[PDB]
Design a protein around this ligand. Structure first.
Ligand SMILES: [Mg+2]
Ligand SMILES: [Mg+2]
Ligand SMILES: [Zn+2]
Ligand SMILES: [Zn+2]
Lengths: 204, 202
C-alpha cells in the first residue's frame, strides 16, 4: 500500500490553503474511528470542503456498516488513495475548531493521529430534527457522491436512505440554520486523481 | 511511506543541503531495487545517508556476497518509502557527481527527476580506490551494516562497498587527498532513517 508521495504531500499542503482555519467547519465520518471509509470536512460559509474515501481493513465489520448505515460497496474503494486520511488530518491547521454530531468516535480518530490540538463541538441535535433536511440535501447535493448504492435497512427492516459523510455535514448545517445553505457553489479542494490512485509509479 | 509530519521534517532538513555546491551520489544495489543511498557534499561535510529493504532477496544475497556484504536482518527496520521521498525532495536542477552514472540515471529517471544532472567523473579503476583503506580508517564508524564477507571473482576476500564511504573515496581520488573537513554530518536523524514507535496510519 503506497501512501502519498512527496509531491502529493506538497500538493495537499498547497490545497489545504483553500481552507479557512477560522471559519466554522463541519466534520463527519462513516465507519468506526479506527477504520473509517469516508471522511467529509465542510465549510458552509464558502462551500469549500474536503471529501474522500478509504478502503476498510475489517471487511466483516464493513459489510454490517454497509447493510445498516452507508450502503457502500467494497469494490468501489479499492482505488482509493492509501494514506490519504492520515495525510489530510496531518495537514489540518493547528488549533482548528470542528463541529459534529456525535463527537465520541471523531475525537478518538483525531487523538489517534496526535491532533489533540483540534477542538470538537458536539452540536447535540435530536434524531428527529437532524434528519429534517435529509431528502432536500440529497435532492440538491446528492450528485457529489455516488458511492452509496447498497440497500440500507433500519431496526424495522424498513429500507432507509443511506448515510453519506458529506451529505450529513450539509444536513447538519441545514438543521442548525433551519434552512439549506445559501451558497452559489461548493467545491472539493481534493482533485479526483488525489482522492483515487493515479497512474502506476515506481516507489522505493 | 512517510507521514505528513515526517515529510515536512524532511523538507526542513533538506535545507541543510547547498543546491549549488559540489555533491557526490552513490548507491548499492540495482537502480530498481537499491539498498543503500548516499549523498555527500565535500565542502562542508553535510550528507544524506539511509538504507532500504530489498524486494528481491535472491539478488540481494548475491550482491551481498560480491559487493556490499550487508545483512538482510539489519534492513527490516529501515523507514519504508524514504528513498522516493528524499529523491523527490532534492533541489531542482541540482548537479550530482558519481562513478557509475548509467544506473543512477535510471534511478533518478524512474522518480521523474530528469532535471537532475549527473557528472560521470573521469576516474581509473585503480586510481578511484587508492584512498579506500584511509577512508574506512577515518570514517568507517559512520556505517556498520557491511558485516558480511565479500570476495572477487576468485575466492580472494576484498573490502565491502559502502555507498557513503565510496562518496568519500571518490572525492579523495578527485583531489588527491582526504577531505579537509573538521566535521561531517548526516542531516537525517536516526528516528527517520529507521522506523520509530508504531503509530496509527489510516
Ligand atoms: Mg455520517
Ligand atoms: Mg558504491
Ligand atoms: Zn458519500
Ligand atoms: Zn554503508
Amino acid at each position: 500500500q503506497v501512501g502519498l508521495s512527496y509531491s502529493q504531500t506538497m500538493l495537499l499542503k498547497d490545497l489545504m490553503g483553500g481552507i479557512d482555519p477560522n471559519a466554522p467547519t463541519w466534520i463527519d465520518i462513516e465507519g468506526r474511528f479506527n477504520d473509517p471509509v469516508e471522511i467529509a470536512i465542510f465549510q458552509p460559509q464558502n462551500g469549500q470542503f474536503i471529501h474522500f474515501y478509504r478502503e476498510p481493513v475489517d471487511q466483516k465489520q464493513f459489510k454490517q456498516d454497509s447493510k445498516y448505515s452507508h450502503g457502500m460497496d467494497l469494490a468501489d474503494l479499492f482505488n482509493a488513495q492509501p494514506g490519504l486520511t492520515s495525510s489530510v488530518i496531518g495537514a489540518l491547521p493547528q488549533g482548528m475548531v470542528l463541529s459534529c454530531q456525535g463527537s465520541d468516535d471523531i475525537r478518538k480518530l483525531l487523538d489517534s493521529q496526535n491532533r489533540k490540538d483540534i477542538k470538537l463541538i458536539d452540536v447535540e441535535m435530536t434524531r428527529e430534527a437532524s434528519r429534517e433536511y435529509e431528502d432536500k440535501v440529497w435532492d440538491k447535493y446528492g450528485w457529489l457522491c455516488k458511492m452509496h448504492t447498497g440497500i440500507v435497512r433500519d431496526k424495522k427492516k424498513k429500507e432507509i436512505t443511506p448515510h453519506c459523510a458529506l451529505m450529513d455535514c450539509i444536513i447538519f448545517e441545514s438543521a442548525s440554520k433551519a434552512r439549506l445553505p445559501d451558497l452559489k457553489t461548493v467545491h472539493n479542494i481534493l482533485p479526483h486523481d488525489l482522492i483515487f490512485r493515479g497512474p502506476n509509479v515506481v516507489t522505493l
